[PDB]
Amino acid sequence: STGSATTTPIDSLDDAYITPVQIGTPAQTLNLDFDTGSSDLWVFSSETTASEVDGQTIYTPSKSTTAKLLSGATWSISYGDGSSSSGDVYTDTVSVGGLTVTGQAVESAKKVSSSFTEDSTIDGLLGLAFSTLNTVSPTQQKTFFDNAKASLDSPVFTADLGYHAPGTYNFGFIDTTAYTGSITYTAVSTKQGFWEWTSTGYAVGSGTFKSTSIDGIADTGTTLLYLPATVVSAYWAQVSGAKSSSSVGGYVFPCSATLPSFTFGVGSARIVIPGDYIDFGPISTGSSSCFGGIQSSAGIGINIFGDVALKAAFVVFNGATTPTLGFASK
Numbered sequence: 001s002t003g004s005a006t007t008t009p010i011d012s013l014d015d016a017y018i019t020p021v022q023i024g025t026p027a028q029t030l031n032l033d034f035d036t037g038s039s040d041l042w043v044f045s046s047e048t049t050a051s052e053v054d055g056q057t058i059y060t061p062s063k064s065t066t067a068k069l070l071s072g073a074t075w076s077i078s079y080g081d082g083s084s085s086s087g088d089v090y091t092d093t094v095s096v097g098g099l100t101v102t103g104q105a106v107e108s109a110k111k112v113s114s115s116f117t118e119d120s121t122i123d124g125l126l127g128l129a130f131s132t133l134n135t136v137s138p139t140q141q142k143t144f145f146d147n148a149k150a151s152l153d154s155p156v157f158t159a160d161l162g163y164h165a166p167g168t169y170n171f172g173f174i175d176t177t178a179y180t181g182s183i184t185y186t187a188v189s190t191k192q193g194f195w196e197w198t199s200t201g202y203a204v205g206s207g208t209f210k211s212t213s214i215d216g217i218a219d220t221g222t223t224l225l226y227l228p229a230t231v232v233s234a235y236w237a238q239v240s241g242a243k244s245s246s247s248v249g250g251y252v253f254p255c256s257a258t259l260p261s262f263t264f265g266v267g268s269a270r271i272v273i274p275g276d277y278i279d280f281g282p283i284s285t286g287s288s289s290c291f292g293g294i295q296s297s298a299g300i301g302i303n304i305f306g307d308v309a310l311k312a313a314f315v316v317f318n319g320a321t322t323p324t325l326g327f328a329s330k
Contacts, residue, residue, distance in 0.1 A: 001151045002172035003099025007034065007161065010121040013281050014307060015223050017161060018121060019169055022095040023106055024064030030057050030123035034169055035221030036159070036195055036317065037304070039133035039143050040077055041094070042085055042107035043124035044116075052112050055120030061108065067092045075107045075135045080222070080300065085112040089136055094144060096126075099171050101148050105134075105141035125221070128157065128317065133193035145171070145319060155319045159220050160330070161311035163277055179314035179328035184269035188323045192302075194219070195317060197325050199305075200267060202227075204235050205260030209270070216303030218315060218325055224280070225262070225273070225308040226297035235262055235294050242292070248283050251292040255282070262294060264309060266327040273312040 007017040018031040023043065030043055044053060046060040061067040067090045076086035087110035094104040109124070116122065127134070131142045149155045152172030160178050161167040168178070189196045194217040203209040214227065232251065236242040238260050242253035253259070259275030278293035293308045316326030 001099055001148075002153055002170070003095075003097035003148075004168060004170045005097030006166050007169055008166045009162065009164065010119070012164065014162075014164060014311065016122065017167070017220070017307070018123075019096070019126070021126060023059050024061070024092045025066040026064075027095070028059050028064065030059060031121065032124045032126040033122050033221060034128060034159075035125050035219070036128040037217060037219035037221045038077065038079065038125060039127040039129045039131055039193065040075060040107050040135055041105065041124070041126045041144055042075065042077070042087070042109055044112070045087070045108040047087060048109045049111055052117045054117050057123045059106065059108065059124075061090045061092070061106075064092055066102075067106075070105060070136075070139075073105075073136050073139065073141075075137070077135045080304075081115070083113045083115045085109045085116060087111065089141070096144065096171065097169070099148055099152075101144055104144055104147055105136060107136065128220070129195065130190050130193045132190070148172075149319055157317050157319070159310055159315045159317065161220065161307055163274075163311050167311070174316060179330040181329055182269075183314070183316055183326040183328040184266045185316070185318070185324045185326045186266050188325055190323060194302075195323070195325055200265030202231055202265065203263040203270075204238050205275075207238075209263065209265070211265075214264075214303055216297075216305050218310060218317070219304050219306050220310060222304045222306030223308070224304075224306050225294045226300060226304040226306065227294065228303065229296045229298045232294055232296045235260070236292065244296075245289075248289070248291065250295040252283055252289045253292055254288055255279070255290040256288070264305070269327065271309070271313045271327055271329060273309060277308055277312060
């Protein structure tokens with residue numbers, strides 16, 4: 001089998017992407033944030049504290065003839081951006097772009113933190129990291145991809161995120177029309193539960209390529225590109241007027257400035273992030289100071305190839321017995 005679904009930016013800045021997911025019988029369609037940096041599929045629901053729901057579409061298990069309580073199961077998660085959610089668990093039928101998993105753990109939120117409540121466009125998350133990170137207790141649950149894997153034509157999914165435009169998540173096949181050149185594959189470590197890999201270096205604009213190993217994760221659930229402070233400093237030094245602002249919480253720059261591209265290495269291959277992808281707009285409405293899309297990972301404890309980086313590529317998440325990542329230009 002295969003599946004194919006369009007993913008759509010939630011706002012004009014590509015702060016995140018939402019993909020429609022069918023849950024239950026009859027289908028309840030929720031718009032979920034596909035997140036290769038976590039491993040829980042959780043939803044706003046009829047069980048979510050009322051004061052914490054503000055415009056989201058909810059899953060109501062009692063209206064699904066295929067929903068079954070996963071008795072005794074609870075979940076609780078905290079994300080790198082400080083947000084969190086928790087609740088109980090049902091199993092139900094979940095379909096993405098034509099691909100159906102029966103018995104998928106659907107984690108129903110009883111509580112969500114403020115940032116979730118405040119984002120009316122995201123109805124939940126669908127985790128696509130390794131199932132070892134899943135937070136369900138006492139019995140850890142499998143991701144949608146893990147459950148689908150054996151049925152897929154090939155044990156892969158692909159992320160093709162758009163710049164200020166929709167893109168595509170495919171399951172079970174590689175769309176050879178969706179990228180240019182070849183796909184370069186690179187090794188993955190699953191030891192921390194992430195799609196963790198090692199970039200071979202970087203370049204800033206037309207500058208010479210610096211060969212240096214940068215370990216990081218391919219994370220569709222993180223908006224920006226977070227890299228070591230040395231790398232980030234080298235980038236912003238090429239932007240007139242750029243500075244690191246402690247009050248804003250990262251590098252900012254005047255929008256009158258032109259942003260250089262940023263290149264990252266995948267083996268001997270190179271992915272070029274255009275300058276425009278690194279502009280995240282005014283720090284506040286009407287400000288002439290713009291927020292940068294490349295930021296320091298110092299204090300995160302890991303480098304993160306988030307949407308800024310991934311949307312410049314066609315990305316293969318290869319879930320073969322030995323997982324790997326593939327990157328192509330597009």
